[PDB]
Write a protein that binds this ligand. Structure first.
Ligand SMILES: NCc1ccc(-c2ncc(OCC3CCNCC3)nc2-c2ccc(-c3ccoc3)cc2)cc1
Length: 164
């Protein structure tokens, strides 16, 4: 049994002086940490909204999450979409405009949370036109929330569906 814990990194908010383009319980952004003999290790990042924890399927892999003294049990998951919901249905219905710049609240392992302002790449798909945000963060930065100018979570780092 892998020991997976949640650690709050910061508040989820859009930052006006973020940093732009390239060159890279309650609510908030949490890191996903696994207990190891070697030491603690961050394999993912998660978003906590309306009492529901959202992360990537591959970070959690369906494993139970420990937060404080209380355990966390997954309600819903979608392996093809790489999304896992803990304690409630998916609460993140926020959509990208497809025409505006976004901020990724990156939570790289061992590194302070930072907001970076970038414009997602756009490419066609059979389902719909999808925005792609691709950066050189460590793997353990997967599940880092992506927000619009409104400060709503438009996607999780790892993919950003465009619906205008
Ligand atoms: N681990 C990275 C990754 C990236 C994209 C997909 C993927 N691969 C294929 C795919 O197909 C589109 C389906 C939409 C529902 N109907 C069938 C097609 N979608 C997606 C997808 C779409 C949206 C998200 C997302 C992130 C945060 O909030 C939503 C994550 C992954 C799978 C793994």
């Amino acid at each position: 049994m892998a020991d997976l814990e949640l650690e709050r990194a910061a508040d989820v908010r859009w930052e006006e002086q973020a940093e732009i383009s390239g060159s890279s319980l309650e609510d908030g952004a949490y890191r996903i940490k696994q207990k190891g003999i070697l030491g603690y290790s961050q394999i993912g990042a998660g978003v906590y909204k309306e009492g529901t924890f959202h992360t990537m399927w591959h970070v959690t892999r369906g494993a139970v999450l420990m937060h404080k003294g209380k355990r966390i049990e997954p309600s819903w998951a979608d392996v093809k979409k790489d999304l896992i919901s803990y304690g409630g249905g998916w609460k993140l219905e926020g959509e990208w405009k497809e025409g505006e710049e976004v901020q990724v609240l990156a939570l790289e392992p061992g590194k302070n949370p930072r907001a970076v302002q970038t414009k997602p790449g756009l490419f066609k798909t059979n389902t719909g036109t999808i925005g792609a945000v691709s950066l050189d963060f460590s793997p353990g930065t997967s599940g880092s929330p992506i927000v619009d100018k409104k400060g709503k979570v438009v996607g999780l780092y790892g993919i950003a569906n465009t619906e205008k």
